[PDB]
Design an enzyme around this catalytic site. Structure first.
Site, PDB file in Angstrom:
ATOM      1  N   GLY B  57       0.820  -1.198   0.000  1.00  0.00           N
ATOM      2  CA  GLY B  57       0.000   0.000   0.000  1.00  0.00           C
ATOM      3  C   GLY B  57       0.857   1.253   0.000  1.00  0.00           C
ATOM      4  O   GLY B  57       1.928   1.281   0.619  1.00  0.00           O
ATOM      5  N   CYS B  84       5.257  -6.126   1.600  1.00  0.00           N
ATOM      6  CA  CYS B  84       5.634  -4.709   1.677  1.00  0.00           C
ATOM      7  C   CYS B  84       4.903  -3.977   2.815  1.00  0.00           C
ATOM      8  O   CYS B  84       5.256  -4.183   3.974  1.00  0.00           O
ATOM      9  CB  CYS B  84       5.440  -4.028   0.318  1.00  0.00           C
ATOM     10  N   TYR B  85       3.892  -3.155   2.523  1.00  0.00           N
ATOM     11  CA  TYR B  85       3.157  -2.456   3.592  1.00  0.00           C
ATOM     12  C   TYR B  85       2.522  -3.447   4.573  1.00  0.00           C
ATOM     13  O   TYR B  85       2.458  -3.185   5.789  1.00  0.00           O
ATOM     14  CB  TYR B  85       2.068  -1.539   3.012  1.00  0.00           C
ATOM     15  N   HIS B 179       7.697  -7.778  -3.917  1.00  0.00           N
ATOM     16  CA  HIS B 179       6.480  -8.323  -4.513  1.00  0.00           C
ATOM     17  C   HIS B 179       6.672  -9.620  -5.227  1.00  0.00           C
ATOM     18  O   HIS B 179       7.169  -9.634  -6.346  1.00  0.00           O
ATOM     19  CB  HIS B 179       5.885  -7.330  -5.496  1.00  0.00           C
ATOM     20  N   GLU B 181       4.385 -11.429  -6.448  1.00  0.00           N
ATOM     21  CA  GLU B 181       3.347 -11.540  -7.460  1.00  0.00           C
ATOM     22  C   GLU B 181       3.740 -10.999  -8.831  1.00  0.00           C
ATOM     23  O   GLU B 181       3.058 -11.296  -9.819  1.00  0.00           O
ATOM     24  CB  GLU B 181       2.012 -10.920  -6.976  1.00  0.00           C
ATOM     25  N   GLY B 234     -21.943 -11.127 -27.974  1.00  0.00           N
ATOM     26  CA  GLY B 234     -20.833 -11.681 -28.715  1.00  0.00           C
ATOM     27  C   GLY B 234     -19.532 -11.376 -27.975  1.00  0.00           C
ATOM     28  O   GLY B 234     -18.482 -11.864 -28.370  1.00  0.00           O
ATOM     29  N   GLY B 235     -19.600 -10.569 -26.913  1.00  0.00           N
ATOM     30  CA  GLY B 235     -18.420 -10.251 -26.131  1.00  0.00           C
ATOM     31  C   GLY B 235     -17.981 -11.455 -25.327  1.00  0.00           C
ATOM     32  O   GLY B 235     -18.613 -12.502 -25.405  1.00  0.00           O
ATOM     33  N   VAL B 236     -16.928 -11.316 -24.536  1.00  0.00           N
ATOM     34  CA  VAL B 236     -16.428 -12.444 -23.748  1.00  0.00           C
ATOM     35  C   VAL B 236     -17.315 -12.932 -22.573  1.00  0.00           C
ATOM     36  O   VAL B 236     -17.678 -14.122 -22.494  1.00  0.00           O
ATOM     37  CB  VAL B 236     -15.000 -12.146 -23.239  1.00  0.00           C
ATOM     38  N   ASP B 237     -17.702 -12.015 -21.694  1.00  0.00           N
ATOM     39  CA  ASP B 237     -18.474 -12.369 -20.510  1.00  0.00           C
ATOM     40  C   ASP B 237     -19.847 -12.933 -20.794  1.00  0.00           C
ATOM     41  O   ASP B 237     -20.231 -13.958 -20.220  1.00  0.00           O
ATOM     42  CB  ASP B 237     -18.571 -11.173 -19.583  1.00  0.00           C
ATOM     43  N   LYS B 357     -11.311 -11.912 -15.177  1.00  0.00           N
ATOM     44  CA  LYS B 357     -11.393 -12.106 -16.628  1.00  0.00           C
ATOM     45  C   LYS B 357     -10.506 -13.188 -17.223  1.00  0.00           C
ATOM     46  O   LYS B 357     -10.900 -13.842 -18.192  1.00  0.00           O
ATOM     47  CB  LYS B 357     -11.162 -10.797 -17.393  1.00  0.00           C
TER      48      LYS B 357
END
Ligand SMILES: Nc1ncnc2c1ncn2[C@@H]1O[C@H](COP(=O)(O)O)[C@@H](O)[C@H]1O
Ligand SMILES: Nc1ncnc2c1ncn2[C@@H]1O[C@H](COP(=O)(O)O)[C@@H](O)[C@H]1O
Ligand SMILES: [Mg+2]
Ligand SMILES: [Mg+2]
Lengths: 499, 501, 501, 499
Positions: B57, B84-85, B179, B181, B234-237, B357
């Protein structure tokens, strides 16, 4: 539950991608073996494979002397997957027809799926204008499969190939005319997985952690409480072997490290420090720089120098091996690729693994990433990096220079960009620097390659400014070097190493 | 088998990488939730985490009302990993001392492991001069931690950072000042795995296949035999939502696909064909181009164009929902990041509410969807309605589709499609001397647009290769009758936005 | 010494390089004129040339009634140099032969010198082991010369062209099948000099300094003590005309500078200050921005706009002219090419009618004018009026005027200006969103246009460096309130044009 | 006519640009000499200059024993033009104030003309917003001129430099803080022309044609009918000297060409065929390959090799000189930069000329362009390009390998893109052509630099495509060569040549 329980047999018909196929199956967590195509029903059934993959091959099935798959393969009762030649030979031996053509194809294409099949259902990369599934693949076809076995169906087609994928869903025989093992085939891995894990029903038990447990178990059953000796080169194979043995038999392992004075800067120190200090292994360190050098004195012939180096290493090792009491085994870092292509027993814990698998278990065993993923170093070491007769002076100059080269390569996010990179010492003098007090100094040459093919390397087009930073450094800080040149020779016509 | 049983809780202290930590944990195969740091013990006890992660943070623990982790976090009896924080606040709340610092470190470093810890045991990236372990990490430390709690030990150090890693092996509390990640931390994932799988003892059941089975079970139980409606874009979701709803309830699903005349070349055909013909979904096709265009007739303000397109869409969708009988539920493709953000007659079925996503795309593949559709660069809601400057006319829309198609084809052939965050064409209603052949004295202009999105406030215009650019430029002018000039957007973000409207 | 005394006559057969041939002779310090091949013995005799050059041309001698040089050319008694087609017509007219063939050649070749000639004696780029001189030349031949006149000798040859250079030393007739006027012929200027200085015996009297003195004399002779008026546009021709006249008649000259509001940043004031404050010329400043914009209001068509600006200028200029008394002459900056092209109340003074543009620039410097003004890339007559697409509004002019200043400043600041043929900004009447700091959403767009001329028909959009481009768009968007986005034209010529409208 | 009548004296204070200044004055058609600043009044007076130029120099007027223009410079009655340090010391010595600075400026700038001066009247590159005159100059500001002499006026200024140009129109002293001799200064040449031609009233008689006449006249006056001997090397200076002498005394010139065996491929043939047949010069051919090699045999130290070659050449040449009857003069191609840097008299026709002038007169005398503009060739030839011992075998391999290199460069239009380009022979071996080629051949290095300063040369970033093409040709074509490397050493730390 043994990790070799479920396994894939891969028959090599000569493709250059055959080891790649084997490696992919390993990556998917399934054990597999790669054999030549000319085998017997005896062998095959002895192996007891969960599924069989027939690779590609340069030869034509239309030829009279062309390789074929043993009929048992198709009678064994297990799924079979044919890749290119494997698909062609599969068609031949089962009823299809094939005819040759002078011009062959090898490249990206999009094939359309026209029928449902266990092998590719749900695997599509793109759609046609009218919503039909397309697969982006890496094609490879010489002969022309004009017809397929009556039992099969057409699964996919493309302009330059009507039978791009054929299948017999009942017998579970599938054949493709592209290479799923090459990343160019976008969803290739997913197709290999579908066959290996779904169709052949193999669990993913071949993982680095389980490979280590199994290896340790096996080392224990073989060696019991006996003592084992091992030569630590500082290389990847012997290092991983040392860790596996150290884990399986602890204090009964003794390692011998021969310092021939032909290694890289800080190489000897880091080897003994990591293994002897950090890991606490019992290491017999032989300082033989003098012994090797005096034996190399006045020898300019590369064939000769290599022989000398190889001979003296055996004398030194044998001597030490004889000073150790109760040693009944010699451990060796032998790897599968080697297998594919006193009186002490032999322990070879890495025998079933590919180089990439060795790096993975190495990490799990606690070895540094950088050591495992570094460029190979020849057996004779600087013995062949020094052109002509080898003197200590030259080797010392060389390792300093090569250290700087490597430092800057990694620092410039370029180390992972080259297949191999070294410095060669040239026994010639040219005008030198104003600080060394030497009018004429020695010369060195950088060598970076990009081994495109197993026999064809490319000279690395390293950035000019980069090379200039390197050149300046080596000449400025490495006292005894007047200038630096860069190898601009490919293979062919030249060879990677100079000697 | 309950794939949500083993779960990680991640408290967000404001780091730009918090969602990234959460995705790595999902990538490792363990369910996890991301919450703001300001929660209560009751909430934590309700969640019942198998382990807790305190993100980084921008704040400083030296500040008077700076964020702090609920104290129960250190009393829950489960492992805690502070990044970190999250490490700095762990030091402070347990007895250590932190010192304020204006100058802050954020970059690559090598820390030396000097003590054993279950967290970093067997993890090495390089060696020191005497063969001691080194870890290549992406450091990030603002204030100076000057003393760790009494029951902790220094696991790794570095020049500027005495306490790079701290641990209390008995309590299973670990703090790192880097980090794991991010990819710059060479074996960061392995470290996250060590924590989530080994230390927290979480099974890895959160996989695409089990997630699908779980989703389906949940859909069937919440909807039963009811009819469900879904707007197919037609989108992804929405596409993945449709496929999940199909697997669960089959015939009881009705997808409404509205062609607003603002989609790309052949898009409506591919959608209809793949979904209806290929997969067998029950689709209501509404050809609404004229209805949308008339509504947009003579509108120049983009703020109004957006409002109009949205307005006409709801009208149309509602009109269709009313023609259907016994429809009790409205399906939506809401994803986890929408919910996290919102945390910052018909019921609702939201099958993807727990997913990020990248996970949606992975399950889309499993469900049989095409890779290129799932990994396609985002397409705005009002589509080409904001890609055509000013008044939207059918003439302009068809010209833009043609040019855009060429621009994308070329990007793909050139292996450049995945080299940019977004790439599209904008139609400019300005005249340029026509092309000899087209027969017009003047034709139109289009602008190519490609960016590398750094963050949701910064994106750079892509330095596409001149030969590539000249090749596209040439093709567009020579192939699309009606376009005589092509330009390239060289405005970054900031001071410009990615889209022009 | 009359600097016009010794002169060369050049007959134009239609080559794109004819004016280049003329310019090179001028560079060698000799006066020359370029006429159509269709002239009479009478006209040629009146001119009395010390030598004659027959240029290249796209036609074929094999075709009936194809261009031919007046036979007086070969009887005049002066040297004649035929270039390409001019050499072919020379062969045909004197007893040689040319076979037709549509297989042309235009490119680099090395011709071998097989015989001695006054034209190439001592001029060679290299030698052959054989002992023969070699010339690197820019070849150009379509039709095939199969025989040269019996009184000519073959001076040079090459594989594809046996008669690359032919000559009659006694008559001093020479013919080459390459262009020595193009720099691609390494020793070309040297050959042209041997012909002009040595062979035709013409001394170099046509020099900047001498051209100025001659022009001043001729002006004082024509105008005498009368008053002369001249419209100052800020361009090259009128500026050099101004300085020439100022030197000739001083106070008797009055300049009229019409400020149309369509000029670049600081231009109108630089004109006034330099010509007025620095050089002390009589300048009537006519403010006319409002008159031009009012007449331009609502006009969108480019052709219309061009007509409007020209109309209003004549109106404004003539009004200001009538206001003046005793002015009996209108000075104009007509240059030679205007006359050449033309070949197909008060008096007129035109001191530059015999000069080519490069000569005008050289005299401008000698006269003390700024280098950048003289060697500046082309600016259109209607100026910004056409660079501002659509309706010309002051707001747009002031925005373009600022964005352009920056573009140009940056090109020059980066030593890139000299590397492009043309470089300017275009104003696009379309808006874009984005300006964060301003809080301003919708602003205008501009396009940067930079090209590299390859030929009269072909130009390449410049591959300007990405960071240079990012710098320019950044400065422009940030420093010009009213501009939200900057694009860069990536259209080549063909299929597109250099200017937009 | 006396083309030396009007001349400019240029005093060098140590700038790299000083020689470039003299060259510009010669380009403008005026004779000039370049001398060191440390001369007396008697010397200057003897020269009788029409004008004086004071150059730049790295020093600073602030250090105690700093270079100062001789006092007479300001009292000679002729114009004086100071550039950079020349301006600074001018300010200093006449009363202005200057003061040291740690950092120095070097780059493009625009200076505003604030006052009229004979030096800049009518010269302007740009305009201010108010229509005021600007000049685009290549600024090189060292120390800080904080004041100028009482009798001087500021002519131009820039923010970061208040005294960009200062002048004393009465005494005709001018000083500028930028380099007019550099092309970065737009109208720099016109500024020099203004000084040299207008202010100094110098006629432009120093032209290639007039210099040739002057030369022929002096040779005839010096030699009469005496016979003259000249060593013809094939290089630019001796070739132009021979053509001048041929024009001046015809048949009385005998050119001696010694083939030492260390020349390039077909060079000897080329020189004889060209000067003998084509130009009709009386050439005495001396084949001395064996005499040179024998004397070079065994020897490996470069310092020794250059010495031997020089020795044996004097031996061979002197022998021939003695065989020739009535030779009273030895002609040499010595040029000005050399000067700035039985017995017979010397004839040195090119002694006052710079290299670029020698080339222009060469073209005038009919020599080919490419031979006049070719890259320099060392006096020792392949002697210093065959590392260590020189053997005919090595020189033979080198010529072929270098011939290919220059052949390719010329074609690719890169030859004129570099200052020097050659190949070096390395007496080290490498693995050769696979299968049918030789196993152990020699190695050669390419060398191509772009000289930035006499003591500074950057290594040419030759295209990768080109480098690959060349390496291939040399390897497969040249029988006896197996590897080609590229020298990536700039100067400093390394030199251009290797020996
Ligand atoms: N310096 C060394 N000290 C001890 N054993 C060595 C040494 N070098 C090589 N060996 C042994 O030789 C094996 C083969 O090395 P390589 O030549 O890399 O395949 C290593 O795996 C070691 O077991
Ligand atoms: N703004 C103006 N003020 C005065 N005279 C002008 C102006 N624009 C054009 N002219 C005159 O018209 C001539 C035509 O020039 P141009 O149209 O620029 O080729 C100029 O050389 C001037 O003599
Ligand atoms: Mg004009
Ligand atoms: Mg010389």
């Amino acid at each position: 539950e043994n990790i070799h329980k479920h396994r894939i047999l891969i028959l090599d018909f000569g493709s250059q991608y055959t080891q790649l196929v084997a490696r992919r199956v390993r990556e998917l967590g399934v054990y597999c073996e790669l054999w030549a195509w000319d085998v017997t029903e005896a062998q095959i059934r002895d192996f007891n494979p969960s599924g069989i993959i027939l690779s590609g091959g340069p030869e034509s099935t239309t030829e009279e002397n062309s390789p074929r798959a043993p009929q048992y393969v198709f009678e064994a009762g297990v799924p079979v997957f044919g890749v290119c030649y494997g698909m062609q030979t599969m068609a031949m031996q089962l009823g299809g027809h094939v005819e040759a053509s002078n011009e062959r194809e090898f490249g990206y294409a999009q094939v359309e799926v026209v029928n449902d099949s266990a092998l590719v259902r749900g695997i599509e990369d793109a759609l046609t204008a009218d919503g039909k599934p397309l697969l982006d693949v890496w094609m490879s076809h010489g002969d022309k499969v004009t017809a397929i076995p009556s039992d099969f169906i057409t699964v996919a087609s493309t302009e330059s190939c009507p039978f791009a994928i054929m299948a017999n869903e009942e017998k579970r025989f599938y054949g493709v005319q592209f290479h799923p093992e090459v990343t160019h085939t976008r969803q290739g891995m997913r197709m290999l997985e579908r066959f290996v894990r779904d169709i052949c029903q193999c669990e993913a038990l071949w993982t680095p952690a389980k490979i280590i447990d199994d290896a340790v178990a096996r080392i224990r059953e073989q060696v019991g409480d006996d003592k084992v000796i091992l030569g630590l080169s500082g290389g990847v194979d012997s290092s991983v072997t040392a860790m596996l043995l150290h884990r399986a038999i602890g204090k009964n392992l003794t390692c011998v490290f021969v310092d021939n004075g032909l290694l890289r800067l800080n190489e000897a120190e880091q080897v003994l420090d990591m293994f002897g200090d950090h890991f606490g292994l019992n290491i017999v360190h032989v300082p033989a720089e003098d012994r090797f050098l005096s034996a190399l004195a006045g020898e300019n012939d590369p064939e000769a120098k290599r022989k000398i180096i190889g001979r003296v290493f055996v004398e030194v090792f044998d001597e030490e091996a004889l000073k150790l009491e109760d040693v009944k085994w010699l451990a060796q870092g032998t790897i599968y690729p080697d297998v594919i292509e006193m009186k002490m027993g032999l322990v070879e814990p890495l025998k079933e693994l590919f180089k990439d698998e060795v790096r993975k278990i190495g990490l799990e065993l606690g070895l540094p990433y950088d050591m495992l993923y570094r460029h190979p170093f020849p057996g004779p070491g600087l013995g062949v990096r020094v052109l002509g007769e080898v003197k200590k002076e030259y080797c010392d100059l060389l390792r300093r220079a090569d250290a700087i080269f490597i430092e800057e390569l990694r620092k410039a996010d370029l180390y992972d960009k080259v297949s191999q990179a070294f410095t060669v010492f040239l026994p010639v003098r040219s005008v030198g620097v104003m600080g060394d007090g030497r009018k004429y100094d020695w010369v060195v040459s950088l060598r970076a390659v990009e081994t495109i093919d197993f026999m064809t390397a490319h000279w690395a087009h390293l950035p000019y400014d980069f090379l200039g930073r390197v050149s300046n450094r080596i000449i400025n800080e490495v006292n005894g070097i007047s200038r630096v040149v860069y190898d601009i020779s490919g293979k062919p016509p030249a060879t990677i190493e100079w000697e």
